[PDB]
């Protein structure tokens, strides 16, 4: 894993779930933050905006 990609579920062959839900990436894409733990959901890119930080994992 490297810089942010939305990887098709098809290609990825890898870590399945976003760290935030401890739930699954699966709705459409695979997301990564190489910066931080590096796997996301679509819920998860949004996760931060009110409740957290600019990114979730980054702290
Ligand atoms: Zn999630
Ligand atoms: Zn991050």
Separation in Å, CA 22 to CA 5, 16, 39, 41: 19, 10, 10, 10
Q: Which of 47, 28, 59, 23 is nearest to 15 (CA)?
A: 23
- Structure tokens, 10: 């098809």
* Distance from the alpha carbon of residue 14 to the mean position of ligand 1, in angstroms: 16
Fold exhibited by the domain 1-59: Herpes Virus-1 (3.30.40)
Closest ligand (CA of 26): 1
The dihedral sign for the CA sequence 33, 29, 12, 18: positive
* Distance from the alpha carbon of residue 22 to the mean position of ligand 2, in angstroms: 16
């Amino acid at each position: 894993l490297d810089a942010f990609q939305e990887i098709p579920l098809e290609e990825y062959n890898g870590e399945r779930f976003c760290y935030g839900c401890q739930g699954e990436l699966k709705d459409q894409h695979v997301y990564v933050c190489a910066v931080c733990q590096n796997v996301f959901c679509v819920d998860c890119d949004v996760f931060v905006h009110d409740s957290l930080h600019s990114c979730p994992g980054c702290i």
